[PDB]
Design a protein around this ligand. Sequence first.
Ligand code: UDP
Ligand code: UDP
Lengths: 366, 366
Amino acid sequence: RPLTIALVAGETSGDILGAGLIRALKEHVPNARFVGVAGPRMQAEGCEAWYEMEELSRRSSHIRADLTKRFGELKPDVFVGIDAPDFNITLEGNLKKQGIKTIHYVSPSVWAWRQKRVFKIGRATDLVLAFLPFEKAFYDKYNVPCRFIGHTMADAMPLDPDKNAARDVLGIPHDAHCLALLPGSRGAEVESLSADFLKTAQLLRQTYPDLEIVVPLVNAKRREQFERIKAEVAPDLSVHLLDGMGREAMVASDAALLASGTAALECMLSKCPMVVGYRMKPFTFWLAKRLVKTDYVSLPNLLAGRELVKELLQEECEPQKLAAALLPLLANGKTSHAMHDTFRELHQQIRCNADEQAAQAVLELA
Amino acid sequence: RPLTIALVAGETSGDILGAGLIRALKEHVPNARFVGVAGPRMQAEGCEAWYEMEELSRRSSHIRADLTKRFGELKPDVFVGIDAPDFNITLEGNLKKQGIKTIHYVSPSVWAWRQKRVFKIGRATDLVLAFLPFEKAFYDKYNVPCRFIGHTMADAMPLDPDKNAARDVLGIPHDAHCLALLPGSRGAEVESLSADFLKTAQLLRQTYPDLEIVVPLVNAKRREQFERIKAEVAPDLSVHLLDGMGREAMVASDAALLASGTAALECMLSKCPMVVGYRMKPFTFWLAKRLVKTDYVSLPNLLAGRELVKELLQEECEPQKLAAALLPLLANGKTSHAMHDTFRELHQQIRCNADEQAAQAVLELA
Ligand SMILES: O=c1ccn([C@@H]2O[C@H](COP(=O)(O)OP(=O)(O)O)[C@@H](O)[C@H]2O)c(=O)[nH]1
Ligand SMILES: O=c1ccn([C@@H]2O[C@H](COP(=O)(O)OP(=O)(O)O)[C@@H](O)[C@H]2O)c(=O)[nH]1
């Protein structure tokens, strides 16, 4: 049987990676066969599309079950889960259980929000392909086979971009200073940063009165959001509102002000000096930092030094798991009595007559 | 001169702490004088109100400037900043510069989101008053004088609450199992958790068909938000919607399902077994964890291993600071050229022909 590769892509970015992977493999094995969940680019390269990438939830669970069986029957030489970790990691695990060799393409950095998920990746995969070196170093800490392959955007973007050519595309004068404002691809980011970014540009106009200001907006919604904010904050500030074209804007500009994330890497490859501005809910940042630091989020467990009360976070905060955790407690029996007694002990440990303690602290210092 | 204490409270919770502190001090010094920013409870105990607590932004900056001068003239024996860290920490610093002894009451855990702010607290204060032991242990790590005084809520809540009395207040039958649902005091929490909490209760009704469900809602907005979600998720689930009364609901219930935060402590003091459910943006949790782990958030600095590009986060993401950071870059001179060359070096380090690397990884495993 000729080399047969199973692929699953779940988004346009993954379809691009998959098509590039197919082309490179056909160079070494022109007879290779490719099947799975394919977008139009993978299909154009010959990927058999059992399902369309756009089809990636009830339906998703059904597809993953079907692929688990079919890939099980097929026994492909390798399975490559292309990104889409919420779908592919579990699938990679199901196939590894059947002895099939699995690769996960792209570090699921956001998805792997806790140690337990790193171990899930390692158990589900024979190898992880990581774009960046510090991602490989991360998995090195866990004896998880990971190969640093470089970043495809670095292959696609030249070392020395043409600033003047980008300015010609955007109609930006070559003699003017030019500032790129990337308020973010997410609504939360745009809402948090757009006003401050506009005020920043207003301040800079005081020094550079002919400063060109280009604003690449990823989609119509984010655009309408930005115009709304601008109308209330800086109605008289003339700017270039662009539909996409963030790459052109950054290659063209002399500096960029970015929310953060993928833009900062693309900006680096554009050779545009940048300043990164970001703002997040302080309350949740504290919770996260609390968790990273202790594995807990709730005060009873911090006071007890153990998982005294059950904490179900993120994907574990789900009805079935919540109900299973509450059922022993609603029984109002032995378990509830033991938690009751520990609660009384901790209550006593922090019952100190704080008003008097504070009053004494004042009097000592005085 | 009789003992003279300066106090600043900025919210109702701080007014309660301040009034309790005033009463305890008057026990030891009935002639003591109290002045500053006082709510109605502090005033009732005799606190001279130079400003009303409700007045705590342009106006806030003006008040803090005025208090910096006046407290400077007064030279109070002690200044106590009662919570409100965004106002009081800077004020405590201004007064310490004048030799005045300062105490900050209540650990500013959320406000102190990074090391630099812990050092700010230590420089601004002679002592921090912390409700909880792990908060004191935190400041012990930084040689920041901190006194663990216990939690005032533990003083106010009895060790053995009366479940049946709370049920009588709420009209809950004594023979029924009762579940408290606290979907959160913030709109983001209610939106994220209300549906899953309702579905959880629906599942539990399958085992406890007479289960009472009490939902304490902090305000009318959060209430309207919850009813809206319930109308779409569980219109036929009968529940008790309460205006506040979270304490009564928890003392009364046999178990509680809580978003998290202050509720979990109050639930512990209510002797109600609990399950903590929480959900936050994965993307921002990763950023935070990224920062906690490295001090950076942007990919260029992670690749460089230093602050190659300026990152201005949270309170530093402000127009004046953003503009000052962009001005050297817009100059498009020596600095921009050095960042350009480093960008080209990092670009080369991750330009590896990833498609071919990935293809080779597949072929090896096959
Ligand atoms: O304010 C902005 C923020 C981002 N982008 C562009 O949007 C693309 C995708 O950004 P995203 O944050 O969505 O990266 P992802 O999460 O998809 O990897 C990037 O090429 C950016 O250049 C933009 O045009 N304006
Ligand atoms: O879904 C909820 C969540 C909280 N609370 C109550 O709201 C009070 C204040 O909660 P918060 O989270 O605002 O604590 P804070 O941040 O003010 O310290 C607490 O006593 C809780 O019992 C409630 O009644 N329903």
